[PDB]
C-alpha cells in the first residue's frame, strides 16, 4: 500500500508531522509513504526513517500557472496512491486537487464556515477548525481517525505514537557538525541560543506576536553569565539563523568571542552536540525536547499547554519560564539566568 501526505507550511508546523508518519508506518506495516510540502518545509525531511522521498509543490499560492499545476497532478496520479491524507484546510477548490488523484480514501481538514465552507461531497472524514494553533496536539484529528477505526487490529494502536523521535545520520552527524563547530570555539560543551531576529528562522507559523525575536540585549545579559563559571566556559553560540552576515557586525553581545553559524533546518545535530540550549518558542524547543538535550524554553506565557505538551520531557529537564506581562520581551531575566546556570 502507498500513502501520500500533503502537509503544508514551513518547518515548525511540519516537524510536528513526524508522529502522524510514524503512526502510518505502525498501523499499516510496510507502507511506502511519500510527502509533498513547501521548499522551506521539505528541508526537514532530511532526518527521518519512514518517508521514501519528499517533494515540493505547494506553498499554496493563488495563480500557480496551469502547467506546473497539471504536471504536479501528473506526478501524484501516475504512482497510484491509496489514501492521500492532507492538510492546508481544503475548501471546495483544493478538494478537487485531492479528488483527481484517483486514490481510494481521501481524508483531510476543512474550513468551518469561512472561505466557502463547502468541504465537498467527494471527500472523507472532514473535521475541525483551520488555523492550526496548538503544537503536539496539532493534527489531533488524525491520531484518532487512524486508531482502531476498522477491525480486529488491537485496541487503539498505541495512542499518539511516542513524541518526536528524529534520528541523525552519522555522516551528517560527524562531518558537517564538526566542520561548523570547530569553525570557532568548539568542545561539545556549549549552549545554543536561537531567537535573535526576523528573516526566516523558524517563525513557528502560529506564535504570531511573541517568540519572533528578542532585542539581543536580554541575550547579551544572559550570555555574560553563561560561560561565567567552569560549567561550560565554552558557550558563546548566539547561533543566528538569519542572513547574520547582515547581523554579526552588530552583536552587542560583544563581538569579542560570540561565535556564529549559518544553518538550514539541519541544526538538530548541532543541538545533539551541545551541552544544552536556551531559546524562545521555536523549532529548537521541539528538536531539543525530542532528544534528551536539556532545554530552556522562554515564550510569552501559559502557551505551554499549546506549544509544549510534554511538560515533563524526561525529568522535567526542559523547563519553561513565562512572562507575567504577557509580552515576551519582558521577563525575570535574573531568575532565567538562575535556572540556566545549573546545566
Amino acid at each position: 500500500r502507498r500513502v501520500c501526505c500533503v502537509v503544508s507550511g514551513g518547518v515548525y508546523e511540519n516537524v510536528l508531522f513526524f508522529p502522524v508518519v510514524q503512526m502510518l508506518k505502525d498501523r499499516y506495516p510496510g507502507v511506502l509513504v511519500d510527502v509533498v510540502a513547501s521548499a522551506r518545509g521539505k528541508q526537514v525531511y532530511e532526518m527521518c526513517k519512514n518517508v521514501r522521498y519528499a517533494n515540493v509543490y505547494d506553498p499554496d499560492d493563488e495563480w500557480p500557472e496551469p502547467a506546473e499545476y497539471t504536471h504536479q497532478l501528473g506526478v501524484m496520479k501516475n504512482r497510484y496512491y491509496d489514501m492521500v491524507l492532507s492538510t492546508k484546510l481544503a475548501g471546495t477548490g483544493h478538494a478537487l486537487f485531492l479528488f483527481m488523484s484517483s486514490a481510494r480514501e481521501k481524508v483531510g481538514y476543512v474550513y468551518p464556515n469561512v472561505n466557502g465552507a463547502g468541504a465537498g461531497l467527494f471527500l472523507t472524514e472532514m473535521f475541525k477548525p483551520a488555523t492550526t494553533n496548538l503544537a503536539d496536539g496539532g493534527y489531533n484529528m488524525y491520531q484518532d481517525m487512524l486508531e482502531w477505526l476498522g477491525r480486529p487490529a488491537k485496541g487503539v494502536p498505541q495512542q499518539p505514537i511516542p513524541p518526536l523521535r528524529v534520528s541523525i545520520s552519522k555522516k551528517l552527524r560527524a562531518v558537517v557538525e564538526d566542520k561548523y563547530n570547530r569553525a570557532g570555539v568548539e568542545k561539545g560543551k556549549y549552549v545554543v541560543i536561537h531567537g535573535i531576529e526576523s528573516d526566516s528562522v523558524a517563525n513557528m507559523k502560529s506564535r504570531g506576536d511573541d517568540d519572533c525575536l528578542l532585542p539581543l540585549e536580554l541575550w547579551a545579559e544572559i550570555a555574560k553569565e553563561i560561560s561565567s563559571g567552569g560549567n561550560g566556559l565554552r558557550p558563546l553560540f548566539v547561533m543566528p539563523h538569519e542572513r547574520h552576515r547582515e547581523e554579526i557586525e552588530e552583536i552587542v553581545g560583544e563581538e569579542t568571542a560570540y561565535l556564529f553559524i549559518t544553518t538550514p533546518g539541519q541544526l538538530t545535530c548541532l543541538i545533539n552536540d551541545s551541552a544544552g540550549v536556551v531559546a524562545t518558542n521555536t523549532a529548537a524547543v521541539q528538536l531539543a525536547n525530542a532528544r534528551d538535550k536539556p532545554c530552556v524554553a522562554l515564550f510569552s506565557s501559559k502557551e505551554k499547554a499549546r506549544l509544549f505538551l510534554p511538560y515533563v520531557e524526561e525529568r522535567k529537564s526542559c523547563t519553561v519560564v513565562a512572562s507575567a506581562t504577557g509580552k515576551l520581551a519582558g521577563i525575570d531575566i535574573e531568575a532565567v539566568k538562575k535556572a540556566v546556570k545549573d546545566l
Binding site: 532530511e46 532526518m47 526513517k49 521514501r52 522521498y53
Partner: protein, 82 residues
C-alpha cells in the same frame, strides 16, 4: 559589354557580365561527401565523457540521479534497527 553612361552629374561608365557555376553544384556536393571522413574524428579519445569524473550516461542521469536521499533515509532506518 562596356556601356558608357553619361550621367547628369559625374563621369560614369560600366562593364558587367553574368556568371554561374554550370553544373559543379554536383561536384561540390560530391566533395562535401567528406562526411564519410567523420570516422577518424570519432575514434579519437573523448574529452571527458569517458573520464573517471563521470558515471551515469543519460540526459538527466548524472544531474537528477539525486535520490540516494531515499537510500540514505533507508540506511537511517536500518541504523535505527541496529
Amino acid at each position: 559589354n562596356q556601356r558608357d553612361w553619361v550621367v547628369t552629374k559625374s563621369i560614369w561608365h560600366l562593364s558587367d557580365t553574368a556568371i554561374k557555376s554550370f553544373y559543379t553544384f554536383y561536384a561540390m556536393f560530391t566533395v562535401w561527401g567528406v562526411c564519410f571522413f567523420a570516422s577518424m574524428k570519432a575514434s579519437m579519445a573523448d574529452p571527458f565523457y569517458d573520464s573517471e569524473h563521470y558515471r551515469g550516461q543519460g540526459g538527466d542521469g548524472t544531474v537528477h540521479w539525486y535520490y540516494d536521499r531515499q537510500e540514505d533515509i533507508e540506511a537511517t532506518a536500518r541504523g535505527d534497527l541496529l
